[PDB]
Amino acid sequence: STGSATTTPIDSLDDAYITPVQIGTPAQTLNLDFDTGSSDLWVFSSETTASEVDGQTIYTPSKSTTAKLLSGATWSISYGDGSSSSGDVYTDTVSVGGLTVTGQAVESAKKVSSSFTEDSTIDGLLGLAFSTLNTVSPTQQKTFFDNAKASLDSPVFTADLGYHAPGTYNFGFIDTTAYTGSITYTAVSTKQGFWEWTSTGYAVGSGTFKSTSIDGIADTGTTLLYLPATVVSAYWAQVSGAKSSSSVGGYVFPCSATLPSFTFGVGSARIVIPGDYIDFGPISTGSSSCFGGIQSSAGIGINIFGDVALKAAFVVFNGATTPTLGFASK
């Protein structure tokens, strides 16, 4: 089997992407944030505290003839941005782009933190990291991809995120029309539950490539590119007026700037992030100070190849017995 679904930016800045997902019988379509940095499929629901729901579409398990309470199971998750959610668990039929999993754990939110409430466009998350990170207790549950894997034509999914435009998540096949040149595959460590890999270095604009190992995670659920302070300082030093602002929370730059590109290495191959991809616009409405799309990972404890990086590539998440990651230009 295969599946193919379009993923769409939630706003004009590509702060996140949403992908329609069919849950239950008859189908209830919710727009979920596909997140290769976590491993829970959770949704706003009829059980979510009413004051914490503000415009989201909810899953109502009582209206699904295939929903079954997973007795005694609860979940609770906290994300790198400080957001969180928790609740109980159903199993139900879940389909993405024509690919159907029966008996998928659908984690129903009883509580969500304010950032979730405040974002009307995201109805929940669909985790695509390794199932070892799944938070369901006392019986850990599998991701949608893990459940689907054995049925797929090939044990892979691909992320093809757009810049200020829709893109695609495919399951079970590689669309050879979706990228240019070849796909370069690179080793993955699953030890922390992530799609963790080591970039071979970087360049800023037209500058020379610096060969240096940068361990980090391919994370579709993180907006920005978080890298070591040394790398980030080298990038922003090429932008007149750019500075790190503790009050704002990162590097900012004059909105009048033209940003240089940023290149990262994948083995001997190179992925170029155009300068425009690194512009996240005014820090507040009407400001001429703009927020940068490359930020320091110092304090996070891990480097994160988020959407800013991933959207510049066609990315293969290869879930074979020994997982790997592939990157192609596009």
Ligand X SMILES: C[C@@H](c1nc(N)nc(N(C)C)n1)N1CCCCCC1
**Interface positions with ligand X (CB under 6 A):** 15, 223-224, 248-250, 280-281, 283, 291
Residue 108 CB, shortest distance to ligand X, in Å, is 28
Q: Which of 14, 33, 35, 160 is catalytic?
A: 35
Q: Is 35 assigned a catalytic role?
A: yes
Nearer to ligand X, 7 or 131 (CB): 7
158: enclosing H helix or E strand: strand 156-160
Is 64 a known active-site residue? no
Distance in angstroms (rounded) separating the CA atoms of residues 218 and 190: 12
Query: Token digits for 91?
Result: 């199993």
| Min separation Cβ 1 and ligand X, Å | 36
Cβ proximity to ligand X, 133 vs 224, nearer residue: 224
Could you tell me the smallest distance in angstroms from the CB atom of residue 243 to ligand X?
13
CA distances from 294 to 13, 24, 159, 285 (A): 14, 39, 20, 21
* Least spacing, CB of residue 250 vs ligand X, in Å: 6
**Separation CA 190–CA 299 (nearest Å):** 22
The 8 Å CB, 24+ separation contacts for 208-212 are: 209/263, 209/265, 209/270, 211/265
Nearer to ligand X, 166 or 249 (CB): 249
User: 206 near 274, Cβ under 8 Å?
Assistant: no
Closest listed residue to residue 45, CA positions, set 100, 116, 148, 99 = 116
* Cβ proximity to ligand X, 34 vs 251, nearer residue: 251
**Alpha helices (H) in 131-278, listed in sequence order:** 144-148, 229-236
State the number of CA atoms in the 13 A half-sphere of 137 facing the CB: 6
- Which of 39, 45, 131, 199 is labelled catalytic? 199
Q: How many residues does the chain have?
A: 330
* Cβ at position 249, least distance to ligand X in Å: 3
Of 227, 189, 233, nearest to 304 by C-alpha is 227
Whose structure tokens read 């240096």? Answer: 212
- Shortest CB 262 distance to ligand X, Å: 16
Closest to ligand X by CB, 116 vs 179, is 116
141-323-202 Cα angle (round to 5): 120
Of the pair 75, 262, the CB lying nearest ligand X is at: 262
Catalytic residues: 35, 199
